[PDB]
């Protein structure tokens, strides 16, 4: 596949375009594809793939040259895929977008290799703090006030735990999901101005005061009756958003892409949701994980101009407004974030503020899956030791480094 000679806006000619993305982003992906298909001759044939299957599916399809036209991937997985030639070089096409500066830059950076560009943002997924205002009220907490520090997060989680009720816990930790753990825990380190990787992405820097404070917090909750919801230790990632949605959890980090479901449940007469940025150990410091899926045109596409038509279309602020803002979801285009949510739910305005304010990060390493997301990764073992066992954070950190720096 090559993007040589394709039109600046791509080709809309009735081609069937295959697109892969992952189950956690299903609500947003269906909205995007339906909007494109209702307005173009080209038609996107969408496949939603379970989060933990996407590596095996991409690796196998790459070997049989059966990758889809458009492959969306978790921004932490993209650098590896881009480095191994999974994507068609679309530098010219990306650099030709008149609004490139407006697009979520972490998604473009994820697919950059020595300045060659392979990806654009597909769906932004940021981590935020959610809490159950009904549990807060019952526990004697001010339901309007989310946690401004990790210490206040522990204090609020402990007050809800002390309700001492079957099925109610202060917080929840995705104990065996390295990907949910980086998403939920990294922002508290960045909030404090600390780093999780070194200057050149080849070493972990998790042996720092902020990360220790975060792990201290979750250990305290692990040692509190009803501190962490049943299933925390065994949570694979397949159910980690369920206990909060089911009203069983006081307060935890959570995906913005899962918040529209909560806001719908509240409209139906369910429990009221609070949303705020994830805090540092340092009070009033905040950040987020600028995650979700980026997308590019696979090396196997026979329809590069037609796939580019989809990428081009979605980058436009009007498209972003239709498929994200108008649906209550966070856009990938800062112009859309600043203009399309003026009478939106203030919690959505809160979510957007964390992106507009610029203090979140997208981590980039070609070894990110092996070091972090993978089942039994050195990062998962680091967290499991610190929260539920004993650990040597210097040793456990160096075990992450040894995977990031492997040649």
Ligand X SMILES: OC[C@@H]1O[C@H](O[C@@H]2[C@@H](O)[C@H](CO)O[C@H]2O)[C@H](O)[C@H]1O
Binding site for ligand X (CB under 6 A): 24, 51, 74-76, 125, 177, 179-180, 182-183, 237, 255, 291-292, 373
Token pair of 93 as six digits: 């096409």
CB nearer to ligand X: pick between 132 and 176 = 176
Nearest CA among 301, 380, 324, 254 for reference residue 69: 301
Give dist(CA 230, CA 165) in Å, integer.
13
Is residue 219 within 8 Å of 158, Cβ to Cβ? no
Measured from each CB, the residue nearest to ligand X is: 179
Least distance from ligand X to the Cβ atom of residue 331, Å: 15
Is residue 291 within 8 Å of 76, Cβ to Cβ? yes
CA 325 → CA 36, 288, 316, 334, distances in Å? 15, 19, 13, 12
CB nearer to ligand X: pick between 153 and 183 = 183
CB nearer to ligand X: pick between 10 and 378 = 378
Least distance from ligand X to the Cβ atom of residue 378, Å: 16
Q: Which residues, listed in sequence order, are joined to residue 16 by a DSSP beta bridge? A: 43
- The dihedral region occupied by 284, where left means phi > 0, alpha psi between -120 and 50, and beta the remainder, is left
CB nearer to ligand X: pick between 239 and 339 = 239
Give dist(CA 372, CA 197) in Å, integer.
12
Least distance from ligand X to the Cβ atom of residue 39, Å: 27
Least distance from ligand X to the Cβ atom of residue 145, Å: 25
Token pair of 346 as six digits: 């203030």
Nearest CA among 305, 291, 303 for reference residue 361: 291
341 three-class SS: coil
DSSP 360: -
Q: DSSP for 33-82?
A: HHHHHTT-SSEEEEEEE-GGGHHHHHHHHHHTT---SEEEEETTTHHHHH
Least distance from ligand X to the Cβ atom of residue 11, Å: 30
| Cβ-proximal residues to 286 (8 Å cutoff; 6+ apart), any chain | 187, 191, 277, 278, 279, 280, 354, 357, 359
Length in residues, the chain: 407
CB nearer to ligand X: pick between 183 and 341 = 183
| Cβ-proximal residues to 340 (8 Å cutoff; 6+ apart), any chain | 317, 320, 321, 324, 325, 326, 331
Least distance from ligand X to the Cβ atom of residue 200, Å: 21
Least distance from ligand X to the Cβ atom of residue 139, Å: 26
Least distance from ligand X to the Cβ atom of residue 236, Å: 8
Least distance from ligand X to the Cβ atom of residue 51, Å: 4
CB nearer to ligand X: pick between 6 and 182 = 182
Least distance from ligand X to the Cβ atom of residue 375, Å: 11
Give the angle 30-111-330 at the CA atoms, nearest 5°: 40
Dihedral sign from CA coordinates of 118, 124, 125, 126: positive
Least distance from ligand X to the Cβ atom of residue 111, Å: 13
């Amino acid at each position: 596949a090559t993007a040589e000679g394709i039109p600046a806006k791509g080709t809309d000619d009735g081609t069937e375009i295959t697109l892969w993305t992952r189950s956690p982003l299903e609500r947003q992906a269906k909205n995007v594809v339906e909007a494109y298909n209702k307005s173009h001759k080209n038609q996107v044939k969408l496949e939603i793939i379970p989060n933990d299957d996407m590596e095996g599916k991409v690796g196998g399809a790459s070997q049989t040259d059966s990758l889809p036209d458009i492959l969306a991937g978790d921004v932490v997985r993209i650098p590896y895929w881009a480095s191994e030639g999974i994507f068609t070089d679309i530098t010219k096409q990306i650099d030709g977008l008149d609004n490139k500066a407006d697009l979520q830059q972490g998604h473009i950076e994820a697919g950059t290799v020595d300045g060659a560009e392979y990806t654009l943002p597909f769906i932004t997924d940021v981590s935020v703090m959610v809490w159950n205002k009904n549990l807060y009220k019952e526990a004697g907490l001010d339901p309007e006030q989310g946690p401004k520090s990790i210490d206040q997060f522990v204090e609020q989680a402990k007050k809800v735990a002390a309700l001492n009720k079957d099925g109610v816990a202060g917080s929840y930790l995705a104990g065996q999901s390295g990907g949910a753990l980086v998403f939920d825990l990294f922002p508290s380190v960045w909030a404090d101005g600390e780093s999780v990787m070194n200057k050149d992405g080849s070493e972990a820097t998790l042996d720092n005061d902020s990360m220790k404070g975060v792990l201290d917090a979750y250990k305290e909750l692990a040692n509190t009756t009803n501190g962490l919801g049943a299933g925390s230790k065994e949570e694979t990632g397949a159910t980690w958003t369920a206990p909060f949605a089911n009203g069983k959890i006081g307060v935890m980090p959570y995906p913005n892409t899962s918040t529209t479901a909560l806001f719908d449940a509240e409209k139906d007469g369910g429990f009221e949701v609070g949303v705020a940025p994830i805090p540092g150990t340092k009070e009033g410091k905040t950040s987020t994980f600028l995650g979700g899926d980026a997308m590019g045109i696979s090396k196997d596409s026979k329809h590069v101009a037609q796939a580019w038509n989809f990428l081009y279309w979605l980058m436009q602020s009007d498209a972003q407004k239709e498929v994200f803002a108008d649906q209550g979801d966070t856009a990938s285009n800062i112009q859309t974030l600043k203009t399309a949510y003026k009478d939106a739910d203030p919690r959505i305005q809160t979510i957007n503020s964390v992106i507009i304010d610029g203090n979140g990060q997208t981590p980039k390493s070609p070894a990110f899956n092996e070091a972090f997301n993978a089942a039994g990764s050195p990062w998962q073992l680091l967290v499991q030791n610190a929260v539920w066992g004993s650990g040597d954070l210097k040793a456990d950190n160096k075990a992450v480094t040894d995977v990031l720096s492997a040649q």
